[PDB]
Design a protein around this ligand. Structure first.
Ligand code: BZB
Length: 356
């Protein structure tokens, strides 16, 4: 890497690791198109395995960027429309609170207060139907945003229904494969287990537990290389050959709703560039934050002058991705500790600001 990239990265990440006591980390900087990789520490403390460019990390909610794009790809194929009622794709959802709730509402957390978590008690699929039927919205659709696995997760599951493909099969075929993300998995194959980092929570090695709608909301594991390729694809969608996938990327970076300085896409969240990190932090320690939203009518197509980003966490991992299309610049930070979001954003901002 250019010494300038080397120096900003090392000066920022070294103190981060020390301060947050992160066991292992991988970072990619995308700079004028090309990726530069950096790794530190341990994928597996007990077995003394280092983090490498092939190490798999749990992305947590960064998985929603994939769900958003796969939804966008289904829209572009004409399989679904965001303006359609949820009940068009799930006819058994006959409870009257569902009248007026569209796939757009699910994708953007605006359905009227769907809960942050699907309950653990929800094992089977009829449990899942029962959960959504019995749910009582606090608000009318399209009035408030409440970040929720149950909202984006349902969007993911329903988006792939017309295809007839399982969510995993649709994701593999329509997103991972075309983009050459060959080390990106919803379920880690036995062949790749050697590379699956452990997460660390209170000193203990942990992996994310199975849960309803896990794949759709928080279930993807990836390497720093595949994540850099993902950022490249999102920086330059119009260079992707598969037409519907190209459209799907642009649809996921469209601005549907505004809360403060933040805009909600499908999975991705965006702010106008330039922006101060105080704004990035604040517009992204709170278990539940209900925020009124203003509809962007109609949605703004992907703005190149944006800070486009997503944070991600599981019990044992913390991830962050941010890019600025106008500057052909991006970063991915993957760690096997869930450490505070403000520290992730600060570090990413320090790096990208220095390089632009
Ligand atoms: B994502 O990394 O923001 C997630 C947030 C939660 C997940 C699972 C359970 C509760 C919150 S994934």
């Amino acid at each position: 890497a250019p010494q300038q990239i080397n120096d900003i990265v090392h000066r920022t990440i070294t103190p981060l690791i020390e301060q947050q006591k992160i066991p292992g980390m991988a970072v990619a900087v995308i700079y004028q198109g090309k990726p530069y990789y950096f790794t530190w520490g341990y994928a597996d403390i007990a077995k003394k395995q280092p983090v490498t460019q092939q190490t798999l990390f749990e992305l947590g909610s960064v998985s929603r960027t994939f769900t958003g794009v796969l939804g966008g790809d289904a829209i572009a194929r004409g399989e679904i429309k965001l303006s359609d009622p949820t009940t068009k794709y799930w006819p058994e959802l006959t409870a009257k609170q569902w009248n007026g709730i569209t796939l757009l509402h699910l994708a953007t957390y605006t359905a009227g207060g769907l809960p942050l978590q699907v309950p653990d008690e929800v094992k089977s699929s009829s449990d899942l139907l029962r959960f959504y039927q019995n749910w009582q919205p606090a608000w009318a659709p399209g009035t408030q945003r409440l970040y929720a696995n149950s909202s984006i997760g349902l969007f993911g599951a329903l988006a792939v229904k017309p295809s007839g493909l399982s969510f995993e099969q649709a994701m593999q075929t329509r997103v991972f494969q075309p983009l050459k993300l060959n080390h990106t998995w919803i379920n880690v194959p036995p062949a790749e287990e050697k590379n699956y980092a452990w997460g660390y929570r209170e000193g203990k090695a942990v992996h994310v537990s199975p849960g309803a709608l896990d794949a759709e909301a928080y279930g993807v594991k990836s390497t720093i290389e595949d994540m850099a390729r993902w950022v490249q694809s999102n920086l330059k969608p119009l260079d992707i050959n598969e037409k519907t996938l190209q459209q799907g990327i642009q649809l996921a970076q469209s601005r549907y709703w505004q809360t403060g300085d933040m805009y909600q896409g499908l999975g991705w969240e965006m702010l106008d560039w330039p922006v101060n990190p105080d704004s990035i932090i604040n517009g992204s320690k709170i278990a539940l934050a209900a925020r009124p939203v203003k509809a962007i009518t109609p949605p703004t197509p992907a703005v190149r002058a944006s800070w486009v980003h997503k944070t991600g966490a599981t019990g044992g991992f913390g991830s962050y991705v941010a890019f600025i299309p106008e500057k052909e610049l991006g970063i991915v930070m993957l760690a096997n500790k869930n450490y505070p979001n403000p520290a992730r954003v600060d570090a990413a901002w320090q790096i990208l600001n220095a390089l632009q």
